Amino acid sequence: SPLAAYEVDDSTGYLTSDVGGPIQDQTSLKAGIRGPTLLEDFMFRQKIQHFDHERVPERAVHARGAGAHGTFTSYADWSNITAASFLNATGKQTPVFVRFSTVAGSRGSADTARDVHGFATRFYTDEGNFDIVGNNIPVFFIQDAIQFPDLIHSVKPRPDNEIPQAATAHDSAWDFFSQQPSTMHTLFWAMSGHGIPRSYRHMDGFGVHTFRFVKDDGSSKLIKWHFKSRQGKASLVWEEAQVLSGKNADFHRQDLWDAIESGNGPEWDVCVQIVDESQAQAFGFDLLDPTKIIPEEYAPLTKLGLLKLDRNPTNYFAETEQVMFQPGHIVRGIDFTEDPLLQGRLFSYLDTQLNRNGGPNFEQLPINMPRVPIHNNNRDGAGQMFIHRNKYPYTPNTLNSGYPRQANQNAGRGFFTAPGRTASGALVREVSPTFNDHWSQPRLFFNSLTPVEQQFLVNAMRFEISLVKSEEVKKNVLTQLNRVSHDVAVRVAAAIGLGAPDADDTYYHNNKTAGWSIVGSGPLPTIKTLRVGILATTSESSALDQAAQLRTRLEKDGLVVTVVAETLREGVDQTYSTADATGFDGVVVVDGAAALFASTASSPLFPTGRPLQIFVDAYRWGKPVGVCGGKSSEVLDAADVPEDGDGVYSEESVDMFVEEFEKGLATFRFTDRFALDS
Amino acid sequence: SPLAAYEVDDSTGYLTSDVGGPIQDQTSLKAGIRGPTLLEDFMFRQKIQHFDHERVPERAVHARGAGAHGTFTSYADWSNITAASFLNATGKQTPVFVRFSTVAGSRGSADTARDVHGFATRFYTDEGNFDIVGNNIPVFFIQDAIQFPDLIHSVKPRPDNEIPQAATAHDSAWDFFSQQPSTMHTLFWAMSGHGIPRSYRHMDGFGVHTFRFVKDDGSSKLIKWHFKSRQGKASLVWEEAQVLSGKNADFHRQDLWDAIESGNGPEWDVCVQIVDESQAQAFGFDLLDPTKIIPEEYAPLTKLGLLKLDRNPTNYFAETEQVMFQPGHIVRGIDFTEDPLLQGRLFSYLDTQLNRNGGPNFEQLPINMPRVPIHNNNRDGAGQMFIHRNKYPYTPNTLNSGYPRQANQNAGRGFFTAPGRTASGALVREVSPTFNDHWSQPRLFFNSLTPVEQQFLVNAMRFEISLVKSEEVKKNVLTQLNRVSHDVAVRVAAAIGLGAPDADDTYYHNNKTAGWSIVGSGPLPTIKTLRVGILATTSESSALDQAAQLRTRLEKDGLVVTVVAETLREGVDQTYSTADATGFDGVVVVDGAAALFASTASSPLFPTGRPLQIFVDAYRWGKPVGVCGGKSSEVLDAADVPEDGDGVYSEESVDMFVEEFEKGLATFRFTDRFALDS
Amino acid sequence: SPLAAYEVDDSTGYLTSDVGGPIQDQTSLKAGIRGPTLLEDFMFRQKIQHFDHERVPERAVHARGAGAHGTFTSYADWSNITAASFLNATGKQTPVFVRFSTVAGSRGSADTARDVHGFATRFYTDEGNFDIVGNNIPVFFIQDAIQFPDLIHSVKPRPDNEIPQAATAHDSAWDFFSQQPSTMHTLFWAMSGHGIPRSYRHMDGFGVHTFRFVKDDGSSKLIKWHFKSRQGKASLVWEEAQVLSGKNADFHRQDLWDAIESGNGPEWDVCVQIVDESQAQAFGFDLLDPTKIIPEEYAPLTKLGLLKLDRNPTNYFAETEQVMFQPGHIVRGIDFTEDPLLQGRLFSYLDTQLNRNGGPNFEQLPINMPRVPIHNNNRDGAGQMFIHRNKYPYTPNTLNSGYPRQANQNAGRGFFTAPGRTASGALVREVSPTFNDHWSQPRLFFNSLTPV
Ligand code: HDD
Ligand code: HDD
Ligand code: HDD
Ligand SMILES: [Ca+2]
Ligand SMILES: [Ca+2]
Ligand SMILES: [Ca+2]
Ligand SMILES: [Ca+2]
Ligand SMILES: [Ca+2]
Ligand SMILES: [Ca+2]
Ligand SMILES: [Ca+2]
Ligand SMILES: [Ca+2]
C-alpha cells in the first residue's frame, strides 16, 4: 500500500498490448494452418521482446537477497544530538524498506551459504530518503574502498571455470586473507555462527563505519549504528546449513515472508553508540578504521527507535530487485567521516545503478522515489518520466524568479557538512599507521565466544582451509591465524597436516567483551514462528490423534507445526518424501508411529530410513527432540538417543511434553552434543 | 492523462536531490577554500551524473522534428466501412500527438533542408493507441523494407568524413537513385516544392501504403490515408530555403509553435481513398507497390474527420524527443497489406525503441502510455514503473481465474487479421513483376506540374547533380531521368555539360492528374499567421507613423507584423542587423524610409546595403512587395523592381495598399519572376 | 582463432590503467593521512567504475551453465544428402564451442536441480557459424513459441516473493502443466532420470525440431539431430541430487572441467534421422510438432561425425558467459521447417542479445566471431570494433564496383531457402488439428522405462 499509486490490477479484463489494444497471445499468425509464422505478427513480437528483455544485471555484490516494507518509530525527540527530521519527536513514524542478503553468491545461490550478510534500510523521511547500508557483522574485511574489487575477485568463483559458487572455501580467497591481514576480524566473524544465521530476523544490522550526528547549531558527535534484533540471535550448524542449501535454497527469504504473513513481523531496536569527536583515537584504535568495534563497556548503546517489518512486496522484481540503496542518500543531521572505506562507497553506489537500471533516472522507480516533493534542474536522460514545467532549469536565473532556491545550513533545511570538519597535510596515497593493528580485535572476538562456539569457528576454518590446494597458501594462512591465537593456529593446522608456526605473542591478550556471542546470548526471548515437525503415520488412527492434539497445544503458543506422514490427508501437512530435519527447529515423534523407526522399515512412498533420519539429523544438529505418548524406548534406541539427554523429551502427557519441549525451543541448541578439541 | 500526473512544478521551493533531500548546487565541497574537490560531494556527483547522461540516441531517420498535441474529431459513424472505435460516432473526439520531421538530417540540422518530411500521428483511442506514421510525399523510394539501410546509407553523409549534412546533393545518393530505378517517383516529389515546404502546416500527410479497413462482420476494403491541409499547400524557393537554413535552422518548429500559441492551430481533413480488394491491380499498377499513387480521378477522397493541433508541449525532451511511434500500434478495424515495405517496417519500429530508450519499458513513458487500462503478462525489464498485483502472469491459468482473457474477432473487441486474407505459392525472395514499371508515374507527376514548377524541379536536379563529382554517376543519372522524360534529361544535361542519351519512349505519355501541383492549387485559403516585414527608419517620425498605421490594419487580419528599423524602440520589433527576407512572406517599405535604400547608405548598426537587400531578396523570391505612402518610385527604382509587375504594390493610401497587398499574400508566390528554359 | 589475438597475459609487468599509464591501485588519494578521498583520484574511479559495471543480465532461460571448446570431425562426404560445407569430406575438422545448462534457475543456482538441460553447439564452419541449440530431452513442453513466456513464468519462482528457486515443485508450474496438455511429454522426461543426469557427459543432445537438409541441386529431406553420448547415459537419484545441490552446486561444471583437464574429454556421435518430405505425417503424428519423437524402429540413426570437447575456457565470463547462440546462425545445406516453436525462436535469439550485450555489435565478441571473412554493409552501433574501408555501404552501388556481391543458390555459396517449400491457405492464428494428441507419446515414453 505505500506504493499503491503504481499498482496494476489484472484480476479482470481482456488481454491488451502495452498500448491498450485488446489482443490474444496463445497462437502465432501463420501463412496457412501448417505454415510459417508472419513478421506482421505484432502480438507475438511485443510479447517475446518483453520476455527477451526481462532480466537486468544482478547486483555486483549482495545479488542474493530479499526485502520487506515496514515502519520506523522514534522513541524520543533526538534534536539534542541530531537535526535529523525522522528522529525529531517521540512516536514519529517513517516508512521503511529493508533488503537482507548474502555477499558473494549470484542471484539463485543458496541463502544458507556461509557469508557476510547485508542489512540495508531505507527511511523514506519527510526531509528525503535516508539509507543505512549495513551488514550483520560490525567490521569489514578491508580499510580502503579501492581494495574492494580485490577482495570480491578473490572470494567470488575462480574466473577460468566460475567455481565455486557462494563460498570462501577456495585457494584465491584464502590467498587474499593471508596476504591482506586487515581481513582477520571480519574473517573470524564470518567463520563464527554469524556467517550462517538462523534467519534474517535472528541477526543484527550494523552501519560498520563511524558517522556523524550533526545538530542544527552545527556541533557534531561520532556515532555507530547498531540494529539489535528483538527476536534474539541464532545460528545454524554448518552440516545443517549445507543440507539446507540443497533442500531449500530459499530458506531465509521464505522464513521472512512467512513471519510477516503470520503477523510476526520482525523488530529491531535502532541504536547508536555516541562519542565525542575528541575520542576518535581514545579507545586504543582509530574510529576511522572499519575493522574495529567500540566495546559496549566503553560506549553504551542508546536506543533511538523501533524498526518493524510488516508488509511483503507485491512484485519482487519491481520492489526488491530494483531497490537501489546508496550511502549518498543522506539527510540533514547526519554526516560522513574520513573512513577511507566509506569515502569510496559514496562513488560506487551512485555509479553502479547506471549498470543496473541502464539509464540515469533510477530514482524515479517507484521503490526509489521519495515521499516529498522534488525540486531540481536535473533533466532528460533515458527513461525520463517527469514533465518539467520550469523551462529555465539553471541557477542563477531571473526568468524562473530564482527558483529553485539554494538550501544550506541557514535556509531551506539544507544538508550541510559538519562545519567543524577540516583537512590538513599532504595529498597522499598512504595508509594511516593508526590502522596497523590487524590482530588484537580478532583475538578479542575469539576470546569472547563460549568454548563450543570457539570449536565451531575452528571447525569452519578446518573445513575451508582443508579445501585450499596450495600448500604455500595454507602455510601463509596459519602464519596469519597464529598472530591472532597460537591455539587457533595449532587446532586448524592439525586438520590439514601442517605444523603451526611458533607462537608470536605480540598481539595476544585475554580481554573479552559482551554481546558478540550467539551461544552466550541466553535463551531466545520468543519462540513464536519456530518450526515443530511432528512425525506420525497414517497406519495408526491413534498416531494422527496424538498429532492433532500436539498441534493444538503447540499452535496456541505461536509455533508453526508440520505434521509429517507417509501420505497427505486432512491433518497431515507434508509427506516423509519431502520432509527433512532442516525444515524444523524441533522434532517430535508420536509413539503410535514407532514402527516407522525400525531398521526393516521400507516404503515406495519415501526413501529408506527417512523417518529415522529426520529424528537422528535433528538430534545431531543440537535440536530439541522427543517422543510423546510414554513409549519412547523403541524410537530413542533406534536413533541411539539417550532418554536422559538434555533437550531430549519423553512424556506421556501432551501438556507436560509441550511445556518441557517449549523450554528446549527457547534454548534452541543443545551444545553438549558437539565434541571439543582437548 | 498520464501526462498531467507526471507534471512537475518548480515555480516555488528549495532545491532538492532526486530523493527529496534539500541541497545546494552552486559550489563544490573542497578541502580548504583553495583546495581539491571531495569525492564525498554527493551534491556535485548526482547533478553531474545526470548532466553526463542527458542525451539519448537520436532517431535513425527523422531525427530532426517537432511535435504538438491536438484532437481528432470524427465527422460520422463509419461502422459501414470500419470497426475502428475512434471513427464510430459523429463528433467522437480522440486526443492526438503529431511529430513532423525531415528524414536525413541529424538532430540539430536545418528544418529547410530539401528532403522528404515525416508526419506521424498518434490517436490515443478508447481501444488503444493507433499510429499513422506517414510522410508529406505519398510514395516511397523503395519497394522492399530490406533495402531501407541501403537507401539511408546512400543519402546520409559519406561515412569517411560525414559530409554532407542533410542533403542528397552528393555522389552516393545519386549513385543509389541511378542504380535503383524504383526511387524515381519519390525523387521527382523531393525535387519539386514538396521537398521544401513553407511550413509543416502547409503540407499534407500520407500513409503511403495501402492498408485495410475491416468491418465487424470481417469484410475488408483497401484504403489510402491522406491528411489534407486546411492551410493550403505552399513551398519555399530553393535559394530562400538555403539562406533560411543559416538564418533560422528552427524555422518550421518556430512556425508551428507560434501558430499554436496565437490560436491558429493547424487543421487537416483526415481522408481515405477506399476501393475493393478486387481492385488491387485494376488501376494499371499493384496496390501493394508503395511507389504508386491512385489518381483521385479513379478513386475520390472520403473525409473521415478533423485533425487539429492546438497545444504545445511542456517539455520537448519528455514529449517530442521520447514519443515512440510504431505502425505496429494498430486497432481493431484496421489491418495491414502485403506491401513488402510496410511488412518490414512492423519489425523495425518495435526494435529501434530499445536503442532509443535503452530498455524495454518505453511504452510506460507518459507520452507513449495509452488512455485505457493495460492488462497483460509482460513483466520486469529495466525501468519497470508498474507494480503488478497479478502473481500468476501466464496463460492458461486457474490461479488468477483465467485472467487476462483472450481477445479476438468474437470476443473482447480483439484485434483480428482480416479473415479474407490468404497466401499461396513458393517461399521466395523474388520481386513481383507487377512492381516493374518505375517510370510511368514519375512522368505523370512531372506532367501534372505547371511550367514554372517543372522548371524549379529541373533546377533542383541541375543544382544537385552539378555537385556529383563522378562523371559516370552523372551519366547513369541521365540514363534514368531519360526513361521518365527526354526533355528533363536534355535540360538537366545542359547544366552539367553532358549530352542526354537518345529518347527512350517506352514509358513516355502525356497524362496528368489533379492535386499534386503546389503552384496550381490556387491562392491560400487563409493568410492568418503569414509574416509581414515593414521596413522603416527611426530618422523620420513620419516613417514610424506610416509603419504603425500599416501595423494596425495588417494585425487586424491576423498577420504577424514585424517593424524593422536601425535600432529598437517602442513600435519597432527587430533591427536591420537581425532582419532577413527569409523572415517574411511579404515586405513593405514605408515612403519616409527611402533614404536607407540609396547605394551610398552605410551604418555601424547593420551591414552595408541590408535594407535594400531585404526588399530585393523578397522580390527575387516571388514574394508580394510594395512601397506604401507617397509617389514612391525612388525605392522601386533603387531595387530595379517594376511598379507594373504582378505582386508589386505602390499606393499612397494605407487602406488601398493593404487591400491589394493581402490579395498578394494569398497568391503567395509570383511565379512570373522566374526564367524558363527557352 | 579470433580468440588468440585477444588473449592478454598478466604474468609479468607493472599495473597500468586501461590506457597503458602505469599506476597503483591499493590506497586512495586523500587530503592528509587521515583525510577525505579526492575526486581527482582517477586510479580509484577507473577501478571502481569497472567493478561497478562488471555484471550483465543473465540469460532469460538457461542462465546456469558451463562451456568448453572442442572439435567436430566428419566421418564422410555427405554431399549426397546436404550441401553443408562442414560435412563435405571424410575427416574434415571444424572447431566447436558447447554450452550445457539447466533452464529455470538463475546464476548461482545448483547444477543438480531437476530440470530440462541445454546442449548448445557452435560449429565455426568455413562457410559461417552454425549453431545447434538443443536440449537433453528430445521434445519440448509447448507447440507454439508465443507460449514460451507463459511456460517460463509458470516454472520460474512466484513473482511476489521469488520462491522457489530452480524447481517446478510449486503450484504455478503444475497449474500450467495441467491446463496446457502439450506439456505432458516433456514433463514425463523431466520427471524421469533425464531430469537429473549424472553429468553433462552422460546425457545426449537433441535439436528437438525437424530441420531440413538441402542439397546443392535444391532437393531436401527432413532431419532430426541426435548427439549420442559415448560415455553412456546415467542419472542421479533424487535424494542424492537434493544433497548434492547443497554440498556442491558446481557439480556438473566441475565434472566437465575435470574430465577435460585429465585427457578424458567427452565425445558424442553427431547423428541424424533422415526421412523424406512426403513422410511429414507418415509416422502417426506431424513432424512439425516438437512434442513428438520418431521411434528409431521407424527411422534409424545415421552417424555423421564425432564431437569431442577437449579444452576448457581461459576466462569464463569472456567465453562461456558471453557466447550468444542463435538458431538463425544457419549455413547453406540446412533449412528450417514450419514448426511454430522453431519459427518463433528465430526472432527471440537475435533480439535477446541486445539485452545481454547492451548493444548491437555482440557478433564481434571474440567467442561469437566467425573464422571466415565478413563482408557486409552493417555499420556503426555502440561498441563498433571494426574500421570499415568501404565508404559506399549500400546496394546497388557503382562507387564500390558492386561489392559486396549478393550470394544465393547460384552465387557466392549463398544460403538459400529450400526451393520446394510452399505455403497455402488463410492467414490464421489457429493450431493444426494434427497437433492435438498430447497423451499417446507420454504413454510410449512411460511404457519404455524399466519397472524401477
Ligand atoms: C567501493 C565499493 C564498495 C565497498 C567498499 C562496499 N560496498 Fe557495498 N556495494 C557496492 C560497493 C561497495 C556496490 C557495487 O555499489 C553495490 C552493489 C549493488 C548496489 O546497489 O551497490 C553494493 C551493495 C551492498 C549491499 C546490498 C544493498 C541491497 O540490498 O541492495 C549491502 C548491504 C552493502 N553493499 C553493504 C556494504 C557494507 C556494510 C560495506 C562496508 C562497510 C560495503 N558495502 C562496502
Ligand atoms: C525498415 C525500416 C524502415 C522503412 C522501410 C521505413 N521506415 Fe520509417 N522509421 C524507421 C524505419 C523504417 C525507424 C528506424 O524504425 C524509425 C526511426 C525512429 C523510430 O521510431 O522509427 C523510423 C522513423 C520514421 C518517422 C518518424 C516518426 C517520429 O516522428 O518519431 C516517420 C514519419 C517515418 N519513419 C515514416 C516512414 C514512411 C512514410 C515509410 C515508407 C512508407 C517509412 N518510414 C519506411
Ligand atoms: C520464443 C522463445 C524461445 C523458445 C520457444 C525457446 N527458447 Fe531457447 N532460449 C530463448 C528463447 C526461446 C532465449 C530467450 O532467446 C534464450 C536465452 C538467452 C539466449 O541466448 O537465448 C534461449 C536460450 C536457450 C539455450 C541456451 C543457449 C546457451 O547455452 O547460451 C538453449 C540450450 C535453448 N534455449 C534451447 C531451446 C530448445 C531446445 C527449445 C525448443 C526446442 C527452446 N530453447 C525454445
Ligand atoms: Ca580459487
Ligand atoms: Ca554458533
Ligand atoms: Ca544500455
Ligand atoms: Ca558521397
Ligand atoms: Ca487473427
Ligand atoms: Ca507458485
Ligand atoms: Ca533413473
Ligand atoms: Ca532464398
Side-chain angles (χ1 to χ4, degrees), chain A residues 1 7 69 312-316 319, chain B residues 387-389 391, chain C residues 159-160:
Chain A
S1 107
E7 287 177 22
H69 295 275
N312 287 313
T314 295
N315 186 269
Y316 183 96
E319 294 171 78
Chain B
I387 304 187
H388 292 90
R389 297 167 54 79
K391 74 181 154 292
Chain C
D160 58 334

Side-chain angles (χ1 to χ4, degrees), chain A residues 44 48 51-52, chain C residues 59-62 99-101 118-120 133-135 140 142 145 148 206-209 323-325 341 344-345 348-349 352-353 356:
Chain A
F44 175 88
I48 300 306
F51 174 76
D52 296 340
Chain C
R59 297 158 172 68
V61 288
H62 302 258
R99 195 172 169 277
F100 305 102
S101 55
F119 190 155
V133 183
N135 281 340
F140 206 63
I142 52 163
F148 191 64
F206 300 96
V208 181
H209 313 288
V323 64
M324 286 160 195
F325 290 95
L341 190 65
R345 282 181 75 201
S348 176
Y349 293 68
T352 199
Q353 316 313 352
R356 287 173 54 188

Side-chain angles (χ1 to χ4, degrees), chain B residues 557-568:
Chain B
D557 295 337
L559 296 160
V560 180
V561 172
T562 309
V563 169
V564 182
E566 301 90 336
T567 60
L568 299 186

Side-chain angles (χ1 to χ4, degrees), chain A residues 298-517:
Chain A
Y298 298 170
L301 287 179
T302 296
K303 294 185 184 187
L304 296 179
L306 175 74
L307 177 79
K308 183 170 177 78
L309 300 179
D310 57 11
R311 180 195 312 272
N312 287 313
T314 295
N315 186 269
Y316 183 96
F317 179 87
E319 294 171 78
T320 303
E321 191 65 17
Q322 286 190 132
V323 66
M324 286 161 191
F325 289 99
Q326 295 194 45
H329 290 156
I330 196 162
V331 290
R332 174 185 185 116
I334 319 293
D335 199 13
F336 311 117
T337 65
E338 303 72 7
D339 172 327
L341 189 68
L342 170 58
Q343 289 273 313
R345 284 177 73 200
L346 298 175
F347 170 80
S348 179
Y349 294 66
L350 174 67
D351 171 53
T352 201
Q353 318 312 354
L354 295 167
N355 170 271
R356 289 169 59 185
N357 195 56
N361 283 309
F362 49 82
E363 308 282 32
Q364 298 182 343
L365 299 175
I367 192 63
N368 293 328
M369 283 280 280
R371 295 181 76 72
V372 291
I374 300 157
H375 293 298
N376 66 46
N377 290 331
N378 298 332
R379 286 296 182 280
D380 309 351
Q384 175 57 245
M385 299 290 290
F386 301 170
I387 296 175
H388 291 90
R389 301 186 165 147
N390 172 27
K391 76 173 139 292
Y392 306 103
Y394 57 90
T395 307
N397 72 81
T398 65
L399 298 171
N400 194 43
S401 306
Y403 292 86
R405 297 215 191 284
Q406 304 288 293
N408 53 50
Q409 187 176 347
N410 302 306
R413 304 294 301 171
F415 183 81
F416 61 103
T417 295
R421 290 177 67 198
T422 65
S424 211
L427 314 189
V428 290
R429 288 181 165 87
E430 283 171 20
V431 179
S432 177
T434 65
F435 282 35
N436 285 351
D437 180 346
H438 307 301
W439 305 275
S440 298
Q441 282 216 346
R443 175 54 174 272
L444 178 67
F445 173 78
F446 182 76
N447 288 346
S448 297
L449 300 176
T450 75
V452 62
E453 276 183 309
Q454 291 177 335
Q455 186 68 55
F456 288 167
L457 184 149
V458 158
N459 289 349
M461 294 184 172
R462 286 174 166 167
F463 181 100
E464 294 224 359
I465 301 164
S466 79
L467 291 175
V468 169
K469 296 154 161 15
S470 164
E471 296 301 297
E472 207 42 34
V473 171
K474 293 195 272 171
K475 286 167 209 278
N476 290 341
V477 167
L478 294 179
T479 298
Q480 271 323 346
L481 294 181
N482 184 60
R483 291 174 179 151
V484 176
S485 169
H486 182 61
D487 190 45
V488 168
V490 165
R491 289 158 73 180
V492 167
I496 64 185
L498 296 184
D502 296 337
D504 172 10
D505 65 8
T506 306
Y507 297 95
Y508 301 168
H509 68 80
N510 235 96
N511 298 311
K512 307 176 173 192
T513 188
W516 300 351
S517 182

Side-chain angles (χ1 to χ4, degrees), chain B residues 31 36-40 44-45 149-151 153-154 158-160 171-172 175-176 179-180 338 347 350-351 354 377-379 390-399 415-419 421-427 429 470 473 476, chain C residues 31 36-40 44-45 147 149-151 153-154 158-160 171-173 175-176 179-180 338 347 350-351 354 377-379 390-400 415-419 421-427 429:
Chain B
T37 301
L38 299 194
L39 186 62
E40 74 171 71
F44 173 86
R45 283 183 291 83
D150 299 296
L151 167 70
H153 283 185
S154 83
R158 203 181 71 190
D160 56 336
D171 289 49
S172 67
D175 189 35
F176 185 76
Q179 295 303 310
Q180 196 63 286
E338 298 78 2
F347 171 79
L350 177 64
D351 173 52
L354 297 163
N377 292 330
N378 299 333
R379 286 297 183 277
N390 169 29
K391 74 181 154 292
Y392 307 103
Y394 56 88
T395 303
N397 74 79
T398 67
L399 296 169
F415 181 85
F416 61 101
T417 296
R421 293 177 66 200
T422 60
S424 209
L427 307 191
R429 287 178 167 93
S470 167
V473 172
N476 292 339
Chain C
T37 298
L38 301 192
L39 187 61
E40 77 172 65
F44 175 88
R45 283 189 285 88
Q147 297 175 0
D150 302 295
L151 167 67
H153 284 185
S154 83
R158 202 180 77 186
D160 58 334
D171 289 51
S172 63
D175 189 35
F176 185 75
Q179 293 304 310
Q180 191 65 281
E338 299 76 8
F347 169 78
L350 180 62
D351 174 53
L354 296 169
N377 288 332
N378 297 335
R379 285 296 184 275
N390 171 29
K391 78 182 145 298
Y392 308 103
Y394 56 88
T395 303
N397 74 79
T398 67
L399 291 170
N400 194 42
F415 179 86
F416 60 103
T417 295
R421 293 178 67 200
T422 61
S424 211
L427 310 191
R429 291 179 168 89

Side-chain angles (χ1 to χ4, degrees), chain B residues 370-495:
Chain B
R371 303 299 168 71
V372 295
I374 302 157
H375 293 302
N376 67 44
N377 292 330
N378 299 333
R379 286 297 183 277
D380 307 352
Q384 174 57 249
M385 296 289 160
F386 301 174
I387 304 187
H388 292 90
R389 297 167 54 79
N390 169 29
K391 74 181 154 292
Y392 307 103
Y394 56 88
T395 303
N397 74 79
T398 67
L399 296 169
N400 191 42
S401 292
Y403 294 101
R405 301 296 290 149
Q406 303 287 296
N408 53 45
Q409 187 173 350
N410 293 311
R413 295 285 301 164
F415 181 85
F416 61 101
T417 296
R421 293 177 66 200
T422 60
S424 209
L427 307 191
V428 292
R429 287 178 167 93
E430 287 170 24
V431 182
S432 178
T434 65
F435 281 38
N436 284 351
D437 180 340
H438 306 301
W439 306 273
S440 296
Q441 283 214 350
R443 175 54 175 272
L444 179 66
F445 174 79
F446 180 80
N447 294 343
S448 298
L449 300 180
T450 72
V452 66
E453 273 179 314
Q454 288 179 338
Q455 187 67 56
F456 289 169
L457 183 147
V458 159
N459 287 353
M461 286 178 182
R462 286 174 166 169
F463 184 99
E464 294 223 2
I465 299 163
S466 79
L467 293 174
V468 169
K469 296 163 300 288
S470 167
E471 296 291 337
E472 291 311 309
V473 172
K474 293 192 273 180
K475 285 153 128 209
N476 292 339
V477 168
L478 293 178
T479 296
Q480 214 58 276
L481 296 179
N482 184 61
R483 291 176 182 152
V484 176
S485 169
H486 182 62
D487 196 41
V488 170
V490 164
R491 290 156 65 176
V492 170

Side-chain angles (χ1 to χ4, degrees), chain B residues 343 636 665:
Chain B
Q343 289 273 309
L636 293 190
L665 289 162

